[PDB]
Scaffold this active site. Structure first.
Site, short mmCIF file in Angstrom:
data_model
loop_
_atom_site.label_atom_id
_atom_site.label_comp_id
_atom_site.label_asym_id
_atom_site.label_seq_id
_atom_site.Cartn_x
_atom_site.Cartn_y
_atom_site.Cartn_z
N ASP A 1 0.77 -1.26 0.00
CA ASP A 1 0.00 0.00 0.00
C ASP A 1 0.80 1.31 0.00
OD1 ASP A 1 0.75 -0.51 2.72
OD2 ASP A 1 -0.91 0.73 3.43
N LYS B 1 0.28 1.56 -5.48
CA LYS B 1 0.43 0.97 -6.80
C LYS B 1 -0.86 1.00 -7.60
CE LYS B 1 3.04 -2.27 -4.79
NZ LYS B 1 1.86 -1.91 -3.95
N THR B 2 -1.94 0.54 -6.98
CA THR B 2 -3.23 0.44 -7.65
C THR B 2 -3.82 1.82 -7.93
OG1 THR B 2 -3.59 -1.56 -6.33
CG2 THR B 2 -5.42 -0.78 -7.70
N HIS C 1 2.41 -6.94 -1.27
CA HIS C 1 2.61 -7.70 -0.04
C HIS C 1 3.71 -8.74 -0.26
CE1 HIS C 1 0.89 -10.28 3.46
NE2 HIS C 1 1.78 -9.41 3.90
N1 LIG Z 1 -2.30 10.99 0.38
C1 LIG Z 1 -2.06 9.95 -0.44
N2 LIG Z 1 -2.48 8.74 -0.11
C2 LIG Z 1 -2.16 7.82 -1.04
C3 LIG Z 1 -1.49 8.01 -2.23
N3 LIG Z 1 -1.36 6.81 -2.92
C4 LIG Z 1 -1.94 5.93 -2.15
N4 LIG Z 1 -2.46 6.47 -1.00
C5 LIG Z 1 -3.16 5.75 0.06
O1 LIG Z 1 -2.53 4.50 0.25
C6 LIG Z 1 -3.51 3.51 0.64
C7 LIG Z 1 -3.36 2.27 -0.22
O2 LIG Z 1 -3.43 2.59 -1.60
P1 LIG Z 1 -3.19 1.47 -2.69
O3 LIG Z 1 -3.15 2.15 -4.00
O4 LIG Z 1 -4.22 0.44 -2.47
O5 LIG Z 1 -1.81 0.87 -2.45
P2 LIG Z 1 -1.33 -0.35 -3.23
O6 LIG Z 1 0.10 -0.13 -3.54
O7 LIG Z 1 -2.27 -0.57 -4.35
N5 LIG Z 1 -1.48 -1.61 -2.29
P3 LIG Z 1 -1.26 -3.07 -2.85
O8 LIG Z 1 -0.09 -2.97 -3.79
O9 LIG Z 1 -1.07 -3.95 -1.63
O10 LIG Z 1 -2.56 -3.54 -3.47
C8 LIG Z 1 -4.88 4.19 0.55
O11 LIG Z 1 -5.35 4.51 1.86
C9 LIG Z 1 -4.61 5.43 -0.29
O12 LIG Z 1 -5.45 6.51 0.08
C10 LIG Z 1 -1.05 9.31 -2.58
O13 LIG Z 1 -0.43 9.66 -3.59
N6 LIG Z 1 -1.38 10.24 -1.60
MG LIG Z 2 -2.05 -3.18 -5.51
#
Ligand SMILES: Nc1nc2c(ncn2[C@@H]2O[C@H](COP(=O)(O)OP(=O)(O)NP(=O)(O)O)[C@@H](O)[C@H]2O)c(=O)[nH]1
Ligand SMILES: [Mg+2]
Ligand SMILES: CO[C@@H]1[C@H](O)[C@@H](OC)[C@H](O[C@@H](C)[C@@H](O)/C=C/C=C/C=C/C(=O)[C@@H](C)[C@@H](O)[C@H](C)[C@@H]2C/C=C/C=C/C=C/[C@H](O)C(=O)/C(C)=C/C=C/C(C)=C/[C@@H](O)/C(C)=C/CC(=O)O2)O[C@@H]1C
Lengths: 367, 261
Positions: free
Chosen positions: A14, A17-18, A58
Site C-alpha cells: 500500500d 500501486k493500484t 505484499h
Molecule cells: N495521500 C495519499 N495517499 C495515497 C497516495 N497513494 C496511495 N495512498 C493511500 O494509500 C492507501 C493504499 O493505496 P493502494 O493504491 O491500495 O496501495 P497499493 O500499492 O495498491 N497496495 P497493494 O499494492 O497492496 O494492493 C490508501 O489509503 C490510499 O489513500 C497518494 O499519492 N497520496
Molecule cells: Mg495493488
C-alpha cells in the site's frame, strides 16, 4: 500500427500501486483518446499503446507479481515519499533483475505529505542507491515525484506529474523488439486436456521462433520426452507460426495431461539440457530485504525456484566457509533432486516458508 | 542541537523503516535518538532492531590467536577493492603482527608506529587509510573466526577443545550477544528495558507476564541464554555441558559500530 509495450506497477505494500494505475488511465484518458491475459489495464500515450498490470506489494503476494514482472518490459516502482524504501521495495527490484525486467522507472508517490525538502533528497538518494546495487542503472534512473491520490481528482498540477511519468514511459523505455534470432525456448505454465483438441500446454515464449509443424524437446522434472507441434493458438484465435515475447499454447499429438507437467522446457532439438548439480553465485537476502532472519549452515534443505517450476535441493559450499548469514553472497554448488533444463547464465531464486531467501545466477552446469 | 539531515538518517539506519516517520517520532523526543527509539518501541510499531551507532563504512577486520593473548583490530580503508588489493590487506597484517607481539590495547600507539607506512601507502594507492580500533582478550583456550572481511570474533574459554571454541565464535559472530549469562546483566540495562516492556498496554495480571518477557529478553542479549545457531532447538547454557567448559569472554568486531565502552 503504433508499437505497444507491456508495463506495470511494482513496489512495497500500500504505497500506492493500484491508485497510481487508476490515476494514469484517468489522466491519460481525459488528456488524449484520439499481449497479456491477466487482469490488466490499457492506456495510450501519443507515442505508444501501453498494456499495464497492477501487482500487489505484499510479501506473500509475490505470486502474480513475478508472473506480471516477467511479462512487463518496464516496471513502475512505487515508493512512498514519506515511508521511503521498504523490504518489499528492494525485494521487488532484486526479483525484477532475476526475472528479466529490462528497465525501471521510479515514482515517488505520496509526495503531498513531504514539506521538508531534505527528506525528499534522502529517499531519492536511498532509492537510487537500491537499484544501483541490484544491477540496475540507478545513477541515471528517472525518479518522478508527485502524488497519485491528489492526481486522481482535479489538480492540474498533480495530474501533470502523472503525464510526466507517462512521458518517461515513452522516454526512458525503448522498443523491446529484440527477442528472437536464437534457438527456441519456452516454459510451461499449465497443462490442459481438451476432449476435442487434445492436450495444450501454455507459457510465454522466452526466446526463439516456433513454427507450427516442427518437433519439440520436452526437458525437465522427469524424462526428456519428444513430440510434435500440432498447432499454436493465442487466446481464442489460431496462429500460422509464432513469435517470441507473446504467450500462447502448443498441442502435442500423442502427449496427454498425465504425460506432461508444469515446469518443463520446450526447445529446439539439441540446445538446452537438464541438470541437477550446478555452479552458482547466489546472493542471500537480509532483514532489510525481507529475507532470512537467522543464519544457516551446510545442512540446509530449502526450496529452489527455477522458471515456472520449483525444485528441492541441497548445498555444498567451498572449503573455507562454514556459515552463511542474511546478507552474504558466496559462490557455491547445489545438487537438486529433479533434473531441470538450464545453461550458462540462468537467474534463479531460493525460498523457504514465506521468507524469501536469496537469489543468484548459474555459473556452469555439471551433472 | 535540533533536527538535521544526518540526524533522522542514522535513526532510520538503525530502525529499518519509516523515513518521515522517524523525524515525526524524533521531534517528539525533542532531538534525542535514544528517547525516540524508546517511544517508537513503546508505540508498538518497532520490532526493536536497535543497531547501536551504525557507521556503515568500509574496511577490514583481522584477528590473530596466540596462546593466552588474542588481539583483534579494525582497519578502515575506502572502496571494497582497496580492502582486497593484497597490499593493504597485507599492510593490516603488518599492523596486526606488531600489535600482537607488542600486546597493545592503546590504539594511539599503533597510530604513530605505522603513520609512516600509512601515508606511504595512502600516497601509493591514492586511498585514505585509517586504523580504527584494537582490543585484546586473555583466556586459557582462544579461538577466532573470520566471517569474511567485515566481521571477526575472538572467544576464549576453559575446557572446550580446539573445535568447540571455533563453533562458539561462529555463534557470536552470528547471533550478536552482549553478555555471557543472564545473571551478569547490568541493572542499568535491565531497568531501562523494564520501562519499555512495562509501558506496553489487563491490570496486575499482564504485568507479571511482562516481567516474564524480560526473562526471555535477558536470554536474548546473553550468550548462554541465546539459542545455538548450528542447532537452535537448544540454547547454549546447556551446551557448555559437552566437554565440561565455560566461556571467559567475548569480542565481536564489525566494520562500523563502536562508540561505546
Ligand atoms: N495521500 C495519499 N495517499 C495515497 C497516495 N497513494 C496511495 N495512498 C493511500 O494509500 C492507501 C493504499 O493505496 P493502494 O493504491 O491500495 O496501495 P497499493 O500499492 O495498491 N497496495 P497493494 O499494492 O497492496 O494492493 C490508501 O489509503 C490510499 O489513500 C497518494 O499519492 N497520496
Ligand atoms: Mg495493488
Ligand atoms: C481456453 O482454455 C484454457 C485457458 O482458459 C486459456 O488461457 C487464457 C488458454 O489459452 C491458450 C490458447 C493461450 O492463449 C494461453 C497461454 C498462456 C500463457 C501463460 C504464460 C505465463 O503465465 C507466463 C507469463 C509465466 O509462466 C512466466 C513464464 C513465468 C511466471 C512465473 C512466476 C513464478 C512465481 C513464483 C514465485 C515464488 O513464490 C517465489 O517466491 C519466487 C521468488 C520464485 C522465483 C522466481 C524466479 C526468480 C524465476 C526465474 O527463474 C525466472 C526468470 C522466471 C520467469 C518465469 O518463469 O515467469 O487455453 C487453455 C486451453
Amino acid at each position: 500500427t503504433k508499437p505497444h509495450v507491456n508495463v506495470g506497477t511494482i513496489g512495497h505494500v500500500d504505497h500506492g500501486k493500484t491508485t497510481l494505475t487508476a490515476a494514469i488511465t484517468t489522466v491519460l484518458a481525459k488528456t488524449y483518446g484520439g499481449t497479456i491475459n491477466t487482469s490488466h489495464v490499457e492506456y495510450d500515450t501519443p507515442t505508444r499503446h501501453y498494456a499495464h498490470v497492477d501487482c500487489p506489494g505484499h510479501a506473500d503476494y509475490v505470486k502474480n507479481m513475478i508472473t506480471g514482472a516477467a511479462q512487463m518490459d518496464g516496471a513502475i516502482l512505487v515508493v512512498a515519499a514519506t515511508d521511503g524504501p521498504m523490504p518489499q521495495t528492494r525485494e521487488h527490484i532484486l526479483l525484477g533483475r532475476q526475472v528479466g525486467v529490462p528497465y525501471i522507472i521510479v515514482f515517488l508517490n505520496k509526495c503531498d505529505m513531504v514539506d521538508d525538502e531534505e527528506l525528499l533528497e534522502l529517499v531519492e538518494m536511498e532509492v537510487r542507491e537500491l537499484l544501483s546495487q541490484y544491477d540496475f542503472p540507478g545513477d541515471d534512473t528517472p525518479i518522478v515525484r508527485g502524488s497519485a491520490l491528489k492526481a486522481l481528482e482535479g489538480d492540474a498540477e498533480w495530474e501533470a506529474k502523472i503525464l510526466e511519468l507517462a512521458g518517461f514511459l515513452d522516454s526512458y523505455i525503448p522498443e523491446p523488439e529484440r527477442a528472437i534470432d536464437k534457438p527456441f525456448l519456452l516454459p510451461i505454465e499449465d497443462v490442459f486436456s481438451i476432449s476435442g483438441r487434445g492436450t495444450v500446454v501454455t507459457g510465454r515464449v522466452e526466446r526463439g521462433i516456433i513454427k507450427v509443424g516442427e518437433e519439440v524437446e520436452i526437458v525437465g522434472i522427469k524424462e526428456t520426452q519428444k513430440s510434435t507441434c500440432t498447432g499454436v493458438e493465442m487466446f481464442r484465435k489460431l496462429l500460422d507460426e509464432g513469435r517470441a515475447g507473446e504467450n500462447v499454447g502448443v498441442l502435442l499429438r500423442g502427449i496427454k495431461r498425465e504425460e506432461i507437467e508444469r515446469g518443463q522446457v520446450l526447445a529446439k532439438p539439441g540446445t538446452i539440457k537438464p541438470h541437477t548439480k550446478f555452479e552458482s553465485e547466489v546472493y542471500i537476502l537480509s532483514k532489510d530485504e525481507g529475507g532470512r532472519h537467522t543464519p544457516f549452515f551446510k545442512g540446509y534443505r530449502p526450496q529452489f525456484y527455477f522458471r515456472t517450476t520449483d525444485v528441492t535441493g541441497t548445498i555444498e559450499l567451498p572449503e573455507g566457509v562454514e556459515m552463511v548469514m542474511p546478507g552474504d553472497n558466496i559462490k557455491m554448488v547445489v545438487t537438486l533432486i529433479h533434473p531441470i533444463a538450464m545453461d550458462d547464465g540462468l537467474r534463479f531464486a531460493i525460498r523457504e516458508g514465506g521468507r524469501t531467501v536469496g537469489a543468484g545466477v548459474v555459473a556452469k552446469v555439471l551433472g | 542541537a535540533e533536527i538535521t539531515a544526518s540526524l533522522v538518517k542514522e535513526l532510520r539506519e538503525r530502525t529499518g523503516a519509516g523515513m518521515m516517520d522517524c523525524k515525526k517520532a524524533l521531534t517528539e523526543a525533542n532531538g534525542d535518538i535514544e528517547l525516540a527509539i524508546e517511544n517508537m518501541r513503546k508505540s508498538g510499531a518497532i520490532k526493536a532492531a536497535k543497531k547501536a551507532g551504525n557507521v556503515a563504512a568500509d574496511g577490514v577486520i583481522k584477528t590473530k590467536i596466540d596462546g593466552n593473548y588474542g588481539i583483534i583490530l579494525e582497519v578502515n580503508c575506502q572502496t571494497d577493492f582497496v580492502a582486497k588489493d593484497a597490499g593493504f590487506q597485507a599492510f593490516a597484517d603488518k599492523v596486526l603482527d606488531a600489535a600482537v607481539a607488542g600486546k597493545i590495547t592503546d590504539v594511539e600507539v599503533l597510530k604513530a608506529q605505522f603513520e609512516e607506512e600509512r601515508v606511504a601507502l595512502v600516497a601509493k594507492i591514492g586511498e585514505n587509510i585509517n586504523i580504527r580500533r584494537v582490543a585484546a582478550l586473555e583466556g586459557d583456550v582462544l579461538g577466532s573466526y573470520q566471517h569474511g572481511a567485515r566481521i571477526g570474533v575472538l572467544v576464549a574459554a576453559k575446557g572446550a577443545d580446539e573445535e568447540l571454541v571455533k563453533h562458539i565464535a561462529m555463534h557470536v559472530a552470528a547471533s550478536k550477544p552482549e553478555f555471557i549469562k543472564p545473571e551478569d546483566v547490568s541493572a542499568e540495562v535491565v531497568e531501562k528495558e523494564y520501562q519499555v516492556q512495562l509501558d506496553i498496554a489487563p491490570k496486575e495480571i499482564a504485568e507479571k507476564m511482562v516481567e516474564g518477557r524480560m526473562k526471555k529478553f535477558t536470554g536474548e542479549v546473553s550468550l548462554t541464554g541465546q539459542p545455538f545457531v548450528m542447532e537452535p532447538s537448544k540454547t547454549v547454557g546447556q551446551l557448555l555441558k559437552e566437554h565440561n567448559a565455560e566461556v571467559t569472554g567475548f569480542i565481536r568486531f564489525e566494520v562500523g559500530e563502536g562508540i561505546e565502552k
